[PDB]
Amino acid sequence: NDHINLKVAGQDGSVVQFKIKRHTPLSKLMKAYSERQGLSMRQIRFRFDGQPINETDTPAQLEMEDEDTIDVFQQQTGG
Protein backbone atom coordinates (compact mmCIF):
# COMPACT_ATOMS: atom_id res chain seq x y z
CA ASN A 1 0.00 0.00 0.00
CA ASP A 2 2.85 2.40 -0.83
CA HIS A 3 1.70 5.47 -2.78
CA ILE A 4 2.96 9.03 -3.23
CA ASN A 5 0.55 11.83 -2.30
CA LEU A 6 1.41 14.66 -4.71
CA LYS A 7 -0.46 17.92 -4.14
CA VAL A 8 -0.28 19.91 -7.39
CA ALA A 9 -1.38 23.55 -7.12
CA GLY A 10 -2.58 25.20 -10.33
CA GLN A 11 -2.06 28.90 -11.09
CA ASP A 12 -5.87 29.19 -11.37
CA GLY A 13 -6.30 28.64 -7.61
CA SER A 14 -6.91 24.91 -8.09
CA VAL A 15 -5.76 22.27 -5.58
CA VAL A 16 -5.82 18.60 -6.62
CA GLN A 17 -4.01 15.57 -5.16
CA PHE A 18 -3.01 12.31 -6.90
CA LYS A 19 -2.12 8.81 -5.66
CA ILE A 20 0.39 6.76 -7.67
CA LYS A 21 3.56 4.66 -7.36
CA ARG A 22 7.12 6.04 -7.24
CA HIS A 23 8.33 3.69 -10.00
CA THR A 24 6.94 5.48 -13.08
CA PRO A 25 7.49 8.74 -15.07
CA LEU A 26 5.46 11.94 -14.55
CA SER A 27 3.79 11.19 -17.91
CA LYS A 28 1.12 9.31 -15.94
CA LEU A 29 0.44 11.95 -13.26
CA MET A 30 0.83 14.83 -15.74
CA LYS A 31 -1.54 13.23 -18.27
CA ALA A 32 -4.14 12.21 -15.66
CA TYR A 33 -3.90 15.71 -14.17
CA SER A 34 -3.98 17.72 -17.43
CA GLU A 35 -6.71 15.44 -18.83
CA ARG A 36 -8.76 15.69 -15.62
CA GLN A 37 -8.22 19.44 -15.12
CA GLY A 38 -8.88 20.72 -18.65
CA LEU A 39 -5.65 21.37 -20.52
CA SER A 40 -3.74 19.88 -23.47
CA MET A 41 -0.82 17.48 -23.91
CA ARG A 42 1.17 20.06 -25.90
CA GLN A 43 1.33 23.00 -23.45
CA ILE A 44 2.15 22.11 -19.84
CA ARG A 45 4.82 22.92 -17.25
CA PHE A 46 5.30 21.42 -13.77
CA ARG A 47 7.09 23.62 -11.22
CA PHE A 48 8.72 21.90 -8.24
CA ASP A 49 10.54 24.25 -5.85
CA GLY A 50 11.47 26.48 -8.79
CA GLN A 51 12.57 23.53 -10.95
CA PRO A 52 10.56 23.26 -14.23
CA ILE A 53 9.99 19.56 -14.90
CA ASN A 54 8.51 17.92 -18.01
CA GLU A 55 6.12 14.94 -18.23
CA THR A 56 9.14 12.77 -19.16
CA ASP A 57 10.50 13.05 -15.58
CA THR A 58 11.37 10.15 -13.24
CA PRO A 59 14.67 10.61 -11.27
CA ALA A 60 13.22 13.48 -9.22
CA GLN A 61 9.88 11.70 -8.76
CA LEU A 62 11.79 8.64 -7.53
CA GLU A 63 13.89 10.70 -5.11
CA MET A 64 10.65 11.76 -3.37
CA GLU A 65 8.94 9.65 -0.68
CA ASP A 66 5.21 10.55 -0.73
CA GLU A 67 4.53 13.98 0.82
CA ASP A 68 5.48 16.42 -1.96
CA THR A 69 3.90 19.64 -3.27
CA ILE A 70 4.05 20.94 -6.85
CA ASP A 71 2.76 23.89 -8.90
CA VAL A 72 1.37 23.33 -12.39
CA PHE A 73 1.85 26.35 -14.66
CA GLN A 74 1.25 27.19 -18.34
CA GLN A 75 4.17 28.92 -20.13
CA GLN A 76 5.14 28.54 -23.81
CA THR A 77 6.27 31.97 -25.05
CA GLY A 78 5.80 32.31 -28.82
CA GLY A 79 8.23 34.50 -30.76
Name the burial class of residue 70, with classes exposed (0-12), middle (13-18) and buried (19+) by CB atoms within 10 angstroms of its CB. buried
Task: Tell me how far apart the alpha carbons of residues 23 and 13 are, in angstroms, rounded to a whole number.
Answer: 29
Q: Which amino acid is at 37?
A: Q
Residues in contact with 20: Cβ distance below 8 Å, sequence separation at least 6, in sequence order = 3, 4, 6, 28, 29
CATH architecture entry for 1-79: Roll (3.10)
Instruction: Compute the distance between CA of residue 45 and CA of residue 74 in angstroms, rounded to an integer.
Output: 6
The contacts of residue 66 (CB under 8 Å, 6+ apart) are 2, 3, 4, 5, 22
Sign of the C-alpha dihedral, residues 47, 22, 25, 15? negative
> How far, in Å, CA of 69 to CA of 6, rounded?
6
Report the phi/psi class of residue 52: left, alpha or beta, with left for phi > 0 and alpha for psi in -120 to 50. beta
d(CA 3, CA 50): 24
